[PDB]
C-alpha cells in the first residue's frame, strides 16, 4: 500500500497468536511491544529516545505478521507507551519512505 | 527520492541558514530539533517519547529545507537525543510509506 502521514501510521499486526495495533516508525531501529508473552530464549536491554531509557526483554527469531506481509526479526518487549514497528521489520516488508 | 530502511534515514536539513543532520521519523506527531536559537515567541509544549515527557520551546511557522524540500511549520526545541523531522514537515514534503 501507499500509506498517508496525515495521521500516525497505524497497522494491525499477527504476533504470538495475537492481534496489536502498532505504529510504523522509521524513526526506531528496534521494534517495541508493550507487555506481553513470548517463546524462546531473551536477554535484558535499555532503549532510550525523548524521555529516556526503559528496561525491556530482547527475543530474537520471532515470526510476525503485517499488513499479510510475514516477517522475522527481534521484538522488544516492556513498559513502553506505544506498540512501534521499528526499522529492523520495516526493511523485510519492503517499506520505504517516498518524496 | 525513495529511501530504504537498512540505515537511518538521516537527511541534511537547513534552518536558520545553518545545515543539519535529522531523522525522518514517521513515529513522530511533530518536529524536534536539539539545542539552537530561532527567532520570535515560543509556547510551551510537553512531547512523550519511549522514556517519559520532555518539555520543549514550540516555535511556529519556521522556514525549514529538508532535503531541499521547502516547508514551513511548527519547530520544538529541546532535550532530544536527535534531532527529529515529524509527520507535521513530513506532510509538508509529500512524503508517505510504501510497500
Ligand atoms: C536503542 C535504539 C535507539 N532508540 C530508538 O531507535 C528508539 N526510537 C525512538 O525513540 C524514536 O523513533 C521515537 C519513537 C516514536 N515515538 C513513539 C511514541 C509515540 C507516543 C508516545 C507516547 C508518549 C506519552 C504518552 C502517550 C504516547 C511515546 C512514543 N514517538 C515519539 O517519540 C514522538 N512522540 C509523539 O509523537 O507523541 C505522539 C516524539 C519524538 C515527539 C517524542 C526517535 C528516536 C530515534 C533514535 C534515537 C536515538 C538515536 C541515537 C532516539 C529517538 C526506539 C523507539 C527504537
Ligand atoms: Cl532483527
Ligand atoms: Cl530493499
Ligand atoms: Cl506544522
Excluded at 5 to 21: A, D, F, M, N
Excluded at 39 to 63: A, S
Excluded at 65 to 74: D, F, R, S
Amino acid at each position: 500500500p501507499q500509506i498517508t502521514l496525515w495521521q500516525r501510521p497505524l497497522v494491525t499486526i499477527k504476533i504470538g497468536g495475537q492481534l496489536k495495533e502498532a505504529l510504523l516508525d522509521t524513526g526506531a531501529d528496534d521494534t517495541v511491544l508493550e507487555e506481553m508473552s513470548l517463546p524462546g530464549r531473551w536477554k535484558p536491554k535499555m532503549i532510550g529516545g525523548i524521555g529516556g531509557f526503559i528496561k525491556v526483554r530482547q527475543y530474537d527469531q520471532i515470526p510476525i505478521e503485517i499488513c499479510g506481509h510475514k516477517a522475522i526479526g527481534t521484538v522488544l518487549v516492556g513498559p513502553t507507551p506505544t506498540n512501534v514497528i521499528g526499522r529492523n521489520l520495516l526493511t523485510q516488508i519492503g517499506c520505504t519512505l517516498n518524496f
